[PDB]
Structure formats: structure tokens, C-alpha cells
Structure 1
Amino acid sequence: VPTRKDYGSKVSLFSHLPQYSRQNSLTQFMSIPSSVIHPAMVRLGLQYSQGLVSGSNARCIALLRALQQVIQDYTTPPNEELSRDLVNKLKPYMSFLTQCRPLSASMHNAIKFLNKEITSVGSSKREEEAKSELRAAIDRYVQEKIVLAAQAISRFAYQKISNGDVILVYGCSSLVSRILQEAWTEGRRFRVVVVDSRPWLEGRHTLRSLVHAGVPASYLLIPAASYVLPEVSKVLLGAHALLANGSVMSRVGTAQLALVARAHNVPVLVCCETYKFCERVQTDAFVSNELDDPDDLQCKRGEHVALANWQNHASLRLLNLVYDVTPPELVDLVITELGMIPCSSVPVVLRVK
């Protein structure tokens, strides 16, 4: 498998991060009937590259379904044990998926759990029995780590929402949308303020999700967040990962919103599951991040595009960050499936399980 090529000139501060282009892909230098990589893995990597699956739990679910299909299509070779052979076989697939798009924390945790489950397979176990048990374990993981873990968080966040509240959300989040919909269904009467940002503009995925539910929702961009915050009662933010030092790694417009919310005495709430907890730490968005396609910053304002041909200018760089890190002092409450714990109890949950 050939390595993916870099596109454009990266920033000096982010020169250690890969920057790819959505237009080009690796499937041009691969077999049409895939042989080295599994066809399901190739489809998943193409969907990750084209941006068809652009979430956090959705990416993990798609990866787990592709892994289930691979295990179902897996056949152990002679003279080899399944425990080592499957682990050695699933490594190039993860390398190709990382080449397509940098993996998320949920995907890393799922890969680690599946590797542990495969390594913990006995030798005397039959092939079909082991494959069926692995599929059942993946199904139970999906059930009790995403589906069952969201209902507990929705039930815990219901007692924190009161009548007449003004909740401010940001971007697109499955857990936040589910919590708001269930709170409106239970009987709570409030209104939501949706904040969005360029170039993904995924906040509209939540806005039209609330109007279809009946919740009165407003829409505005992230530069106008300090104007609407004086009327906001509480801020509900989604988390892509909770680091071992209490910091919150999420969409690039999260730490800024939490900082501006602190200046207005607005409590900041973070919702995340226990399967997204990382044992690693991070103090700034410079050591580990993701550089998306820099051609997405181009916008047509008026008649022409100011960034139509930015490659001609030598000293012109286009930075398109994806993730950012929020310090623990800006987070007031963290809602998980175990209960409402402070932002400093992240290692404890990492130690219990």
C-alpha cells in the first residue's frame, strides 16, 4: 500500500501533522477487487476520506461493523493460531484507515478492546465459535458503550434542565441532540441557541434536528457568541475525548466557547461516555491535532474568491484545524453514564475500569 501524499504547504507550527487533500485518494493505486486490504476496509477508508462519515460515535460504529464483517470473512491459515494471526492481520487495515483519515479516540479505544478480546481467545476454541463470540462481544460493546451509555446520560442531564432555560449548544453532537429531544419529550420547556462555525457548518445538522422535534431554536455564528451569551442560562458542549489530565479534546470551537462563557458567569457542561476516556494527556492543540483540506477555507463573497489561487503566493499558508483542547478549570460539570462527576475524576473512571 503506497503512502498518501501531502497537499499544499503546511504551517511551520503544524509541520509535524499530515495534511491531505479530499480530491485525491489511495484507491487509484490499488486493486479494483481488493486483495491486500479487505473490501469492507477499503469502503470504510473511502467513506472516511470523502467525509461521508464525519462524526465520532458513527465512525466507531462503522469501524466495528467493518471489523465484524472482516472477522466473518476471516479464515485462519494452517499451522497458525487465531489469537496471533488475527491481530497481525488487522494491523495493515488500521494503518490504511489511518492513512485515509487520522483515527479518533473512540476508534482507538475500540481497536484496543477488540485486540484484547482477540488475544484473550483460548487455543482449544473452534474457529466458527470464536468468530461468533467475537461478533457477539462487538455487539455487546456497541450496545452497552454507546446505546445504553446514552440513555443514562440523557436521564442524568434531565434533572439539570429547568423550565425557561436557555441552553447554548455548539456544532453537531449525537448525545447533545438526544438529550435535548428527550428533555423536550419528558415535559421540559426551554429554548436552544445553536452555534456554528466554518467550513463544516455541521451545526445545521442539529438545528434542523430540533425544529423537527418542536424545540424553539436560534442560529448564529461563533464570532457572535459574546452577544448572545448574556441571555444564555447554561452551555451544553459535546466531547470527542476526555484526557487523563482533565482536559477536553473536542471540535476547535469548544475551548473558545468555554472561555467566553466563563466571562459571563454561564455554567459549562460537558457530556461524554466512559469509553472515550484517554489515558494520555495533552496541554495544547499543537502537539496532536488534525489538518483537514486547506481548500475548504475558500468562500465566494460577492463576485470573486479571495483565496482562489493561494498556492501561487509563496508565503501564504492556510490553516484548517479540526480539534482543540480545553483546560479543566473552564469545565464545571461532566455528565457520564456513572453519574455527574467533576472534571478531575477522569483518572478515577480510568482506574475503576
Structure 2
Amino acid sequence: LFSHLPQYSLTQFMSIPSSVIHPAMVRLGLQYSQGLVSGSNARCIALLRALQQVIQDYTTLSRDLVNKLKPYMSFLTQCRPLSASMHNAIKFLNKEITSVGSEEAKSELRAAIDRYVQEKIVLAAQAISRFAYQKISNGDVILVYGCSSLVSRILQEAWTEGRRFRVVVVDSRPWLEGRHTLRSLVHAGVPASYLLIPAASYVLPEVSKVLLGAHALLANGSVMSRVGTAQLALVARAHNVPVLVCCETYKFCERVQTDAFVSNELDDPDDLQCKVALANWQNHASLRLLNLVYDVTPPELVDLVITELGMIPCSSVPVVLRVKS
């Protein structure tokens, strides 16, 4: 089954002027739980802004700040399981606090978040956009999947820098998230097409390249991302179309994983019933509703990783994990 991975449907116990967890961290955790903030980049930006709020309210430092904000990340692991972008952000923040030696260290810390967000989430996105501009030619059609803040940025800037392509947006239940791509494409004027994952093998005959987004690249080259990505890349290879995944460097986790079973958050199963024949699923004892959030595609199904350092073949992501550390 999925026993080790956690099932969740958390702010009732805490006091309204909360003292156990910081106010900003309570807002952040409840926005994670309800779904107001989605996407690995958006979650990392929101986390780092909330941590800047935590540090500017901190009054006394190196050990104290780390063991003070470890319960905050325990709360966030309870509210919505942390993706690896958040994990590396927290690792960098703890290394930054432990690096600060013997007031003025709060301003130097808070700017290091700004020097983290800029040259690893924003400048990295611009560099990945420049690299993926090369792989997008006139007339080809690009299959994207779900919503990615980087994939849609790549498509939009490739369109506004003169390309004339077409996008096919493949989407999955229950998040129905590629609509947030689709609408954002139509505002840019890009021609678009929308369909679900089961119809992917219908349009992979016409698709020229599959351009996906990664929530984490693991230490063997497996791409941990949204649950339809691995299946979509498998059908993409079976129709021999190249698969490109666009991931920043800071999402590279040194965790390694073979199958799509080890670290895969489960959203609440109550999302699954569609308009109903499944509303009373709790009373069926044998029936269990399962929706994964993430799966891993193997590096042999991915032809290219686009990174702010360059374009790498998805078997040399441990190379980048070495040279940045």
C-alpha cells in the first residue's frame, strides 16, 4: 500500500494570537493546507518571505534561530509535506544562520533570502528561458503538462521573442491544474489545445517535443514531479518525441529513489469524486481512494534537462549537484 506516506484531509488547537508558531508561519501553513499557494517555486517564494518575516521579528544567534525555527518546519511538514525546493531552501537558510558569527545580522540574513530568491529562482528562470528558447523552433508543437511557473514562462517568452509555435496542454484530475496554464497561454496569444492525460497518446503523434516541469531532480537523474509526468514521458518516448524538463539548480535533491513509492505525498482522497457514484466511499470498507501528488520518471525517459547552468542530459545531474556544493 502507501502506509509510510501520510494521508491528510490543523489550526484548531493553536491560539489566535499564536505563540507556539509564528503568525506568518501559521498563515503560510494554512495557505498550504487549503491550497491558496501551489507550485514548488510559489511555495518556496512564500516560505522565504515568511522566513524573512520571522527573522525581522526575531529578538535575541546561530544555534538559537535554528532550533527556534525547526518547530516551524515541523508545523509546515504537518500542514503540507515539503517539496525538495523547500527542503533545499531550509537547508541553505540553516547553513546561513550557522555561518553567521558573533541586530545587524538580521539585516544581513534577510538580504541573503533576497540574494537567494533572485539568483536561484528568478535569474535561474530567466537563464532557463534563454536556453529553452534555442530548443523551440518555428512551427513545432509543444506538449506541456499541468501548471508550471517556469514552463509557462519559457513558452511566453519564446513566443514574445518571435517564435510561432503551438502548445498542447495535457491536464489531469483532480487538481485540473493545466487550465491555469491554458488561460495563461491564451492571454499571451499562443495557440493552444487542451485535453486530459488519457488522450495523450492521441496527440503524441502530432507533438514535436514534450516540455515538462520538475519539482525535484534526484541524485540519480529521476525527475520527481506531478503525478502524470512520468506516464506522459513514457508515452512520449513510445511515440519517439523528445522530452525536455526545465528545472532550476536549487531543486536538486541528493535523495535518491527508484520507484514512485518512497516520497510521494497523498492529497485528500475526497477530491476524487466527480459530478456521483463515489460520494459514499468511506462506508465501503474495501474501497480505498488513492491520489498521489508526485511520481518519478527514470532518466532514460528524459532526453534533456534545462538548467540555469546549461542543458544537461539528465544523467549528469549529479555533476551539477557536485559543482554547486
Please, what TM-score do these two structures have when normalized by structure 2? Answer: 0.98
| Cα distance in 2 between the residues matched to 1:261 and 1:55 | 23
Deviation at 1:265, TM superposition (A): 1.2
| Cα distance in 1 between the residues matched to 2:272 and 2:121 | 33
| Cα distance in 1 between the residues matched to 2:321 and 2:112 | 21
| Cα distance in 1 between the residues matched to 2:14 and 2:150 | 37
Please identify the structure whose Cα radius of gyration is greater.
1
Q: Flag structure 1 segments of 5+ consecutive residues without an equivalent.
A: 1-12, 77-81
Q: 1:181-230, CA deviations, whole angstroms, 9 ceiling, x for partnerless residues?
A: 11110110010000001000010001000110010000111000001110
Deviation at 1:27, TM superposition (A): 1.3
| Cα distance in 2 between the residues matched to 1:26 and 1:49 | 8
Q: 1:124-171, CA deviations, whole angstroms, 9 ceiling, x for partnerless residues?
A: xxx921000000111000000011001111011111111100100000
| Cα distance in 1 between the residues matched to 2:312 and 2:292 | 30
User: Is 2:100 aligned against 1:121?
Assistant: yes
Q: Flag structure 2 segments of 5+ consecutive residues without an equivalent.
A: none
Q: 1:2-47, CA deviations, whole angstroms, 9 ceiling, x for partnerless residues?
A: xxxxxxxxxxx10111111xxxx82111101101111111110110
| Cα distance in 1 between the residues matched to 2:76 and 2:128 | 30
| Cα distance in 2 between the residues matched to 1:159 and 1:242 | 22
Deviation at 1:321, TM superposition (A): 0.7
Q: 1:45-64, CA deviations, whole angstroms, 9 ceiling, x for partnerless residues?
A: 11001010011100000000
| Cα distance in 2 between the residues matched to 1:26 and 1:270 | 35
**C-alpha root-mean-square deviation of aligned residues, in Å?**
0.9
Q: 1:268-314, CA deviations, whole angstroms, 9 ceiling, x for partnerless residues?
A: 111000000011100111111111110000111xxxx1111111111
| Cα distance in 2 between the residues matched to 1:92 and 1:267 | 43
Match of 1:102 in 2: 81
Superposed, 1:207-222 pairs within 5 Å as 207-222=182-197
| Cα distance in 1 between the residues matched to 2:40 and 2:263 | 17
> What secondary structure does 2:133 align onto?
coil
> What secondary structure does 2:259 align onto?
coil
Match of 2:51 in 1: 67
Match of 2:199 in 1: 224
Q: 1:310-348, CA deviations, whole angstroms, 9 ceiling, x for partnerless residues?
A: 111111110011100100100111110111111111111
Structure 1 segments (4+ residues) deviating >3 Å: none
Deviation at 1:177, TM superposition (A): 0.5
| Cα distance in 2 between the residues matched to 1:85 and 1:328 | 41
Please, what TM-score do these two structures have when normalized by structure 1? Answer: 0.91
How many pairs does the alignment contain? 324
Match of 1:79 in 2: none
